[PDB]
Design a protein around this ligand. Sequence first.
Ligand code: 86V
Ligand code: 86V
Lengths: 237, 229
Amino acid sequence: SLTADQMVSALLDAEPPILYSEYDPTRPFSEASMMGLLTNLADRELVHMINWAKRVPGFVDLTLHDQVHLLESAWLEILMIGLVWRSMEHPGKLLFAPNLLLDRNQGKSVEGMVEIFDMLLATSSRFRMMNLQGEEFVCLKSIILLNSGVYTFTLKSLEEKDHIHRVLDKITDTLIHLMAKAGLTLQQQHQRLAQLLLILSHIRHMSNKGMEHLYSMKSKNVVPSYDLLLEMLDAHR
Amino acid sequence: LALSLTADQMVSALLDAEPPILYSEYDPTRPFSMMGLLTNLADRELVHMINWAKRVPGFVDLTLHDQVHLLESAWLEILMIGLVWRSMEHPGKLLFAPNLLLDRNQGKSVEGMVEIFDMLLATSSRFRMMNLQGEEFVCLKSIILLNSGVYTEEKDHIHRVLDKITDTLIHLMAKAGLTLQQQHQRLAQLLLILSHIRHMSNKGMEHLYSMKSKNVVPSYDLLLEMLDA
Ligand SMILES: CC1=C(c2ccc(O)cc2)[C@H](c2ccc(OCCN3CC[C@H](C)C3)cc2)Oc2cc(O)ccc21
Ligand SMILES: CC1=C(c2ccc(O)cc2)[C@H](c2ccc(OCCN3CC[C@H](C)C3)cc2)Oc2cc(O)ccc21
């Protein structure tokens, strides 16, 4: 029932905070410590992501089961687009945190990492060339949340999918509204809409390559479990 | 040059450039290697894909080097969307060839295959649900060709062609009688399906690699030879 303006306002209000890496001026940054710091940040960002997701219009209208499925599908894509967004104004660097700004040479320290760094930096550059606006960014991130898991899900399921498609349609309306307000021609509007949504194909690509890379590290866990996501999502009262 | 085409001229060019549907190489008199059949078919399909790519307006304006890199990035996605397209009118089945229609039970035959089968089937179902038209299909396939490798003067040209295809898609929908709102909603719906096709190609590549076959990706030299400089 939201208007385009109401949709933008809700998404902007729902934005999670930018988190920091730990501070210590007695411990100089080490290559050996890098993955540990990144993991610690990612895990903390995930908790805020679940909060954010619950504030995306239409998301909590879904079953808890399907909310979990959508986050299972989208969580790394969402981490990545978030990273690319806060890195946009910093050519050649990834702003994992304001006190953890890394370049591709530092990425070389971890086997297989520089390939993923390069893809993320390329996305940052693309954002920059398009002059991506914050209002557009929060629309794109919401689209990832709703769309990424919708092809891999009963009567209830059909109802859910119809709802997701209607919300996705409203976000399309919202993007078009924003561009119309920016003074773009109708032609420029459709063209930019297309340009923006094609970036999501690259973000999906990066998530899949990234997931493969994280698994190759043979750590205890990579993905947040169904259990964990449910626990974070399945709040009482 | 090819950017000077009208929307109608663009559509006609793409429709005319469509590759043929090939047959599986087996003797139908004999008892029914699935991956063997599929690999043989994919490899033959690839040749026709390269000749199709050369007819996508704007593609051959790129350097041969860049043409090859786009094909390197896009070939599996393009195989997949073509498979989904010809499987649309066959619910629950994948029409790999007219003489090779497989259902998901058949897919189980091969380890790790049914997961990718189900994704392909879901895409075919989505196409049918959206009543995807042939004119839209050829635009989407062209977008995959130009977009899949663009992150890995030339880039400006690629974006110009992509913008032209967007114009063409919107033109088709307007002609179909859709309102402006329906036009940009349907455009978005179609482009979001492309992210799923990318996903499928990613998981498909993982699966093909896990089989530890001889090769998986076509070499630079193979693609370049097919391009016939
Ligand atoms: C994009 C990205 C990272 C990354 C690094 C390599 C790679 O192949 C894919 C993602 C790494 C990264 C990403 C995900 C990681 O998963 C650790 C396992 N956690 C994830 C959630 C679950 C509770 C367990 C560990 C490190 O760092 C980031 C931190 C952020 O706050 C936001 C994005 C990242
Ligand atoms: C989608 C698809 C196939 C497939 C099966 C499992 C999988 O994990 C990914 C793709 C299999 C398939 C797809 C690609 C294959 O690559 C074999 C290696 N070739 C590819 C080109 C290069 C010259 C070497 C082998 C089998 O069959 C198809 C045949 C088609 O004419 C069109 C699409 C396919």
